[PDB]
């Protein structure tokens, strides 16, 4: 007997690819080996949304034993295409809001797996390393996004619980970033950039202003660190995938996906931009369990 596994992935991308690596290793380690007692059917949508649906529909017609969906849109397409083939997700921030599961603890649907949620607290802990004497935390965010409000509320709860002040700048368009960061200068000791496409995608502009005014920037994710943020405590995607693969072992052995809690991970890595660190005139922390990257052009 050979278990048929469909893997649906949105696009080639280091984080998404890493989840797949980990998922396959975890299966291998538990005796599920491609070309022997499982058959892995990998499909990349190459960033095209209708292709996520075609992949999902193929997997349903193929009658896979399990679908592994990497990214929110890949998982949504899978769930729209089949309600009776188990789906394990990964790299999905908010499975409840994506419509995949009733609750994290008890999905009550044919979907479980992992979320790549990281708390604001993980990032803000890096204040102790890169902004030791800080009193005021800055945050710029997109006022049109609900998920940005939720993060800003969490930052303000952290600040209240830890004795910091907060200065915020809510914006709606990309053309407000320059002036927004320029006016936070002299009012903050550290900037937190949340998971917010508007602000995070502007990191080259934010990084220049912040860095030339000696303000370290902490980002929620690692992509912005490569673009000029100083640091993040980012999710280890290969380990998140590995965990999803352990969950796959249980589903392949017949356990109920509707009762399997959606897991999050505590495996993060501190990632630091080495060029920004030098530009701020700072030495490396002496803890060896920190990764370094340079700025991407």
PDB file of N, CA and C in Angstrom, residues 20-63:
ATOM      1  N   UNK A  20       8.526  22.718   3.174  1.00  0.00           N
ATOM      2  CA  UNK A  20       8.417  21.488   2.426  1.00  0.00           C
ATOM      3  C   UNK A  20       9.557  20.556   2.767  1.00  0.00           C
ATOM      4  N   UNK A  21      10.766  21.112   2.853  1.00  0.00           N
ATOM      5  CA  UNK A  21      11.943  20.336   3.267  1.00  0.00           C
ATOM      6  C   UNK A  21      11.692  19.647   4.604  1.00  0.00           C
ATOM      7  N   UNK A  22      11.217  20.403   5.586  1.00  0.00           N
ATOM      8  CA  UNK A  22      10.988  19.870   6.922  1.00  0.00           C
ATOM      9  C   UNK A  22       9.905  18.819   6.972  1.00  0.00           C
ATOM     10  N   UNK A  23       8.796  19.088   6.276  1.00  0.00           N
ATOM     11  CA  UNK A  23       7.686  18.140   6.151  1.00  0.00           C
ATOM     12  C   UNK A  23       8.166  16.794   5.599  1.00  0.00           C
ATOM     13  N   UNK A  24       8.946  16.808   4.526  1.00  0.00           N
ATOM     14  CA  UNK A  24       9.445  15.567   3.953  1.00  0.00           C
ATOM     15  C   UNK A  24      10.437  14.829   4.876  1.00  0.00           C
ATOM     16  N   UNK A  25      11.325  15.565   5.536  1.00  0.00           N
ATOM     17  CA  UNK A  25      12.250  14.934   6.518  1.00  0.00           C
ATOM     18  C   UNK A  25      11.540  14.257   7.645  1.00  0.00           C
ATOM     19  N   UNK A  26      10.538  14.934   8.194  1.00  0.00           N
ATOM     20  CA  UNK A  26       9.763  14.371   9.290  1.00  0.00           C
ATOM     21  C   UNK A  26       9.065  13.069   8.885  1.00  0.00           C
ATOM     22  N   UNK A  27       8.514  13.029   7.675  1.00  0.00           N
ATOM     23  CA  UNK A  27       7.903  11.790   7.194  1.00  0.00           C
ATOM     24  C   UNK A  27       8.952  10.676   7.037  1.00  0.00           C
ATOM     25  N   UNK A  28      10.071  11.035   6.425  1.00  0.00           N
ATOM     26  CA  UNK A  28      11.189  10.097   6.219  1.00  0.00           C
ATOM     27  C   UNK A  28      11.659   9.469   7.538  1.00  0.00           C
ATOM     28  N   UNK A  29      11.896  10.318   8.527  1.00  0.00           N
ATOM     29  CA  UNK A  29      12.306   9.893   9.867  1.00  0.00           C
ATOM     30  C   UNK A  29      11.333   8.923  10.566  1.00  0.00           C
ATOM     31  N   UNK A  30      10.050   9.034  10.248  1.00  0.00           N
ATOM     32  CA  UNK A  30       9.025   8.135  10.766  1.00  0.00           C
ATOM     33  C   UNK A  30       8.682   6.984   9.809  1.00  0.00           C
ATOM     34  N   UNK A  31       9.560   6.694   8.842  1.00  0.00           N
ATOM     35  CA  UNK A  31       9.369   5.562   7.930  1.00  0.00           C
ATOM     36  C   UNK A  31       8.421   5.739   6.737  1.00  0.00           C
ATOM     37  N   UNK A  32       8.077   6.975   6.383  1.00  0.00           N
ATOM     38  CA  UNK A  32       7.305   7.254   5.160  1.00  0.00           C
ATOM     39  C   UNK A  32       8.218   7.839   4.079  1.00  0.00           C
ATOM     40  N   UNK A  33       8.524   7.019   3.073  1.00  0.00           N
ATOM     41  CA  UNK A  33       9.618   7.309   2.151  1.00  0.00           C
ATOM     42  C   UNK A  33       9.109   7.377   0.723  1.00  0.00           C
ATOM     43  N   UNK A  34       9.364   8.516   0.081  1.00  0.00           N
ATOM     44  CA  UNK A  34       8.865   8.792  -1.245  1.00  0.00           C
ATOM     45  C   UNK A  34       9.457   7.764  -2.191  1.00  0.00           C
ATOM     46  N   UNK A  35       8.631   7.277  -3.096  1.00  0.00           N
ATOM     47  CA  UNK A  35       9.033   6.241  -4.024  1.00  0.00           C
ATOM     48  C   UNK A  35       9.029   4.843  -3.423  1.00  0.00           C
ATOM     49  N   UNK A  36       8.703   4.693  -2.128  1.00  0.00           N
ATOM     50  CA  UNK A  36       8.696   3.377  -1.482  1.00  0.00           C
ATOM     51  C   UNK A  36       7.293   3.100  -0.984  1.00  0.00           C
ATOM     52  N   UNK A  37       6.875   3.672   0.151  1.00  0.00           N
ATOM     53  CA  UNK A  37       5.500   3.477   0.666  1.00  0.00           C
ATOM     54  C   UNK A  37       4.615   4.754   0.666  1.00  0.00           C
ATOM     55  N   UNK A  38       5.140   5.867   0.138  1.00  0.00           N
ATOM     56  CA  UNK A  38       4.354   7.067  -0.189  1.00  0.00           C
ATOM     57  C   UNK A  38       4.736   7.570  -1.585  1.00  0.00           C
ATOM     58  N   UNK A  39       3.828   8.339  -2.174  1.00  0.00           N
ATOM     59  CA  UNK A  39       4.063   8.994  -3.467  1.00  0.00           C
ATOM     60  C   UNK A  39       3.745  10.474  -3.324  1.00  0.00           C
ATOM     61  N   UNK A  40       4.770  11.312  -3.418  1.00  0.00           N
ATOM     62  CA  UNK A  40       4.601  12.765  -3.278  1.00  0.00           C
ATOM     63  C   UNK A  40       4.392  13.405  -4.629  1.00  0.00           C
ATOM     64  N   UNK A  41       3.269  14.109  -4.771  1.00  0.00           N
ATOM     65  CA  UNK A  41       2.916  14.844  -5.967  1.00  0.00           C
ATOM     66  C   UNK A  41       3.024  16.348  -5.642  1.00  0.00           C
ATOM     67  N   UNK A  42       4.140  16.946  -6.003  1.00  0.00           N
ATOM     68  CA  UNK A  42       4.385  18.373  -5.733  1.00  0.00           C
ATOM     69  C   UNK A  42       3.874  19.260  -6.874  1.00  0.00           C
ATOM     70  N   UNK A  43       3.063  20.263  -6.553  1.00  0.00           N
ATOM     71  CA  UNK A  43       2.598  21.241  -7.504  1.00  0.00           C
ATOM     72  C   UNK A  43       2.824  22.685  -6.962  1.00  0.00           C
ATOM     73  N   UNK A  44       3.574  23.454  -7.713  1.00  0.00           N
ATOM     74  CA  UNK A  44       3.783  24.910  -7.468  1.00  0.00           C
ATOM     75  C   UNK A  44       2.839  25.719  -8.376  1.00  0.00           C
ATOM     76  N   UNK A  45       2.043  26.620  -7.793  1.00  0.00           N
ATOM     77  CA  UNK A  45       1.146  27.484  -8.548  1.00  0.00           C
ATOM     78  C   UNK A  45       1.843  28.671  -9.209  1.00  0.00           C
ATOM     79  N   UNK A  46       3.114  28.894  -8.903  1.00  0.00           N
ATOM     80  CA  UNK A  46       3.882  30.013  -9.508  1.00  0.00           C
ATOM     81  C   UNK A  46       3.139  31.332  -9.309  1.00  0.00           C
ATOM     82  N   UNK A  47       2.629  31.516  -8.094  1.00  0.00           N
ATOM     83  CA  UNK A  47       1.967  32.711  -7.669  1.00  0.00           C
ATOM     84  C   UNK A  47       0.624  33.058  -8.353  1.00  0.00           C
ATOM     85  N   UNK A  48      -0.006  32.108  -9.051  1.00  0.00           N
ATOM     86  CA  UNK A  48      -1.228  32.379  -9.829  1.00  0.00           C
ATOM     87  C   UNK A  48      -2.408  31.828  -9.032  1.00  0.00           C
ATOM     88  N   UNK A  49      -3.367  32.677  -8.656  1.00  0.00           N
ATOM     89  CA  UNK A  49      -4.459  32.197  -7.807  1.00  0.00           C
ATOM     90  C   UNK A  49      -5.361  31.127  -8.452  1.00  0.00           C
ATOM     91  N   UNK A  50      -5.764  31.319  -9.727  1.00  0.00           N
ATOM     92  CA  UNK A  50      -6.554  30.253 -10.330  1.00  0.00           C
ATOM     93  C   UNK A  50      -5.828  28.910 -10.375  1.00  0.00           C
ATOM     94  N   UNK A  51      -4.502  28.916 -10.488  1.00  0.00           N
ATOM     95  CA  UNK A  51      -3.751  27.646 -10.429  1.00  0.00           C
ATOM     96  C   UNK A  51      -3.791  26.933  -9.065  1.00  0.00           C
ATOM     97  N   UNK A  52      -3.932  27.685  -7.964  1.00  0.00           N
ATOM     98  CA  UNK A  52      -4.116  27.084  -6.650  1.00  0.00           C
ATOM     99  C   UNK A  52      -5.415  26.238  -6.667  1.00  0.00           C
ATOM    100  N   UNK A  53      -6.437  26.721  -7.378  1.00  0.00           N
ATOM    101  CA  UNK A  53      -7.708  26.003  -7.477  1.00  0.00           C
ATOM    102  C   UNK A  53      -7.618  24.761  -8.361  1.00  0.00           C
ATOM    103  N   UNK A  54      -6.911  24.874  -9.484  1.00  0.00           N
ATOM    104  CA  UNK A  54      -6.634  23.738 -10.403  1.00  0.00           C
ATOM    105  C   UNK A  54      -5.870  22.600  -9.732  1.00  0.00           C
ATOM    106  N   UNK A  55      -4.851  22.979  -8.969  1.00  0.00           N
ATOM    107  CA  UNK A  55      -4.079  22.011  -8.148  1.00  0.00           C
ATOM    108  C   UNK A  55      -4.970  21.289  -7.147  1.00  0.00           C
ATOM    109  N   UNK A  56      -5.759  22.080  -6.430  1.00  0.00           N
ATOM    110  CA  UNK A  56      -6.661  21.530  -5.442  1.00  0.00           C
ATOM    111  C   UNK A  56      -7.638  20.576  -6.070  1.00  0.00           C
ATOM    112  N   UNK A  57      -8.196  20.971  -7.221  1.00  0.00           N
ATOM    113  CA  UNK A  57      -9.161  20.162  -7.915  1.00  0.00           C
ATOM    114  C   UNK A  57      -8.520  18.880  -8.428  1.00  0.00           C
ATOM    115  N   UNK A  58      -7.296  18.959  -8.916  1.00  0.00           N
ATOM    116  CA  UNK A  58      -6.593  17.742  -9.343  1.00  0.00           C
ATOM    117  C   UNK A  58      -6.403  16.733  -8.201  1.00  0.00           C
ATOM    118  N   UNK A  59      -6.019  17.243  -7.020  1.00  0.00           N
ATOM    119  CA  UNK A  59      -5.756  16.410  -5.866  1.00  0.00           C
ATOM    120  C   UNK A  59      -7.030  15.673  -5.428  1.00  0.00           C
ATOM    121  N   UNK A  60      -8.161  16.370  -5.470  1.00  0.00           N
ATOM    122  CA  UNK A  60      -9.460  15.774  -5.191  1.00  0.00           C
ATOM    123  C   UNK A  60      -9.818  14.666  -6.199  1.00  0.00           C
ATOM    124  N   UNK A  61      -9.671  14.963  -7.481  1.00  0.00           N
ATOM    125  CA  UNK A  61      -9.876  13.961  -8.554  1.00  0.00           C
ATOM    126  C   UNK A  61      -8.909  12.773  -8.436  1.00  0.00           C
ATOM    127  N   UNK A  62      -7.649  13.052  -8.118  1.00  0.00           N
ATOM    128  CA  UNK A  62      -6.659  11.996  -7.842  1.00  0.00           C
ATOM    129  C   UNK A  62      -6.984  11.137  -6.615  1.00  0.00           C
ATOM    130  N   UNK A  63      -7.857  11.637  -5.734  1.00  0.00           N
ATOM    131  CA  UNK A  63      -8.173  11.043  -4.458  1.00  0.00           C
ATOM    132  C   UNK A  63      -6.916  10.770  -3.621  1.00  0.00           C
TER     133      UNK A  63
END
